[PDB]
Amino acid sequence: IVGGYECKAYSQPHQVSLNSGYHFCGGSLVNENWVVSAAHCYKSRVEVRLGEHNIKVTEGSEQFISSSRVIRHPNYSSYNIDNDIMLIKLSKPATLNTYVQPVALPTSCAPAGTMCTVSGWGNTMSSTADSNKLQCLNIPILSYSDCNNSYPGMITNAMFCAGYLEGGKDSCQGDSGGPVVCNGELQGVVSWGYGCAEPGNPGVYAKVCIFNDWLTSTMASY
Ligand SMILES: [Ca+2]
Numbered sequence: 001i002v003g004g005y006e007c008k009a010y011s012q013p014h015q016v017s018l019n020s021g022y023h024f025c026g027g028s029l030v031n032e033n034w035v036v037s038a039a040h041c042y043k044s045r046v047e048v049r050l051g052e053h054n055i056k057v058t059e060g061s062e063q064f065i066s067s068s069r070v071i072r073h074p075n076y077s078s079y080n081i082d083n084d085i086m087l088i089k090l091s092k093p094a095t096l097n098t099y100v101q102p103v104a105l106p107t108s109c110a111p112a113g114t115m116c117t118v119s120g121w122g123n124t125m126s127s128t129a130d131s132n133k134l135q136c137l138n139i140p141i142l143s144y145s146d147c148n149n150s151y152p153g154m155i156t157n158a159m160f161c162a163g164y165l166e167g168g169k170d171s172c173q174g175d176s177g178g179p180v181v182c183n184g185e186l187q188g189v190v191s192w193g194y195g196c197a198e199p200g201n202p203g204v205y206a207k208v209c210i211f212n213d214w215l216t217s218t219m220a221s222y
Contacts, residue, residue, distance in 0.1 A: 001102035002171035004137030017049040026178025032093040037177035039076035039086040051099035061099035062199040106185040109209040116182040122174030163202040172196035
């Protein structure tokens with residue numbers, strides 16, 4: 001996260017770290033058994049680390065839970081990063097507590113101008129902001145017209161842009177798969193962009209609201 005601030009106590013309890021020997025992607029807990037992340041973060045098995053603030057320190061709030069299933073959206077396409085969403089089933093339920101709490105999946109799409117929060121442990125492009133301490137940033141949803149203008153022909157129904165076309169504030173490398181929360185619910189998944197925080201190159205996010213039926217029916221196959 002570039003241009004953000006260290007997240008406050010208690011504040012992003014749905015944020016998870018995906019780990020394969022190291023942090024490589026974020027994700028969001030959406031109920032006791034399931035995490036939503038980005039399909040480009042797929043690995044056949046992952047350790048989900050919940051209750052984290054500093055990913056390098058054992059704080060006593062963490063839960064480490066292996067995946068039992070990792071399910072990419074069936075229409076994920078790497079050439080264009082389309083349908084960049086994935087479900088991870090936890091091999092045992094997460095324990096919900098002060099530090100670990102799910103975020104709801106919205107059935108309605110947030111309009112242009114809505115202020116949201118993105119978070120993660122990715123690059124900060126800052127000499128004093130520590131990427132190991134979870135970072136938070138407020139970003140507004142951009143219009144479709146500005147999103148497509150930034151990346152002509154590259155924006156699909158499954159994407160939205162959010163951030164600042166002036167540059168300086170964005171998600172980055174290592175934030176992928178993590179949450180964009182708007183009015184308390186998971187509107188986006190960190191997906192792609194050209195560079196990080198560059199003028200004219202806003203962040204692109206998977207548009208969670210149009211995947212509700214895939215998400216809920218996949219999770220219901222207990
Ligand atoms: Ca920790």
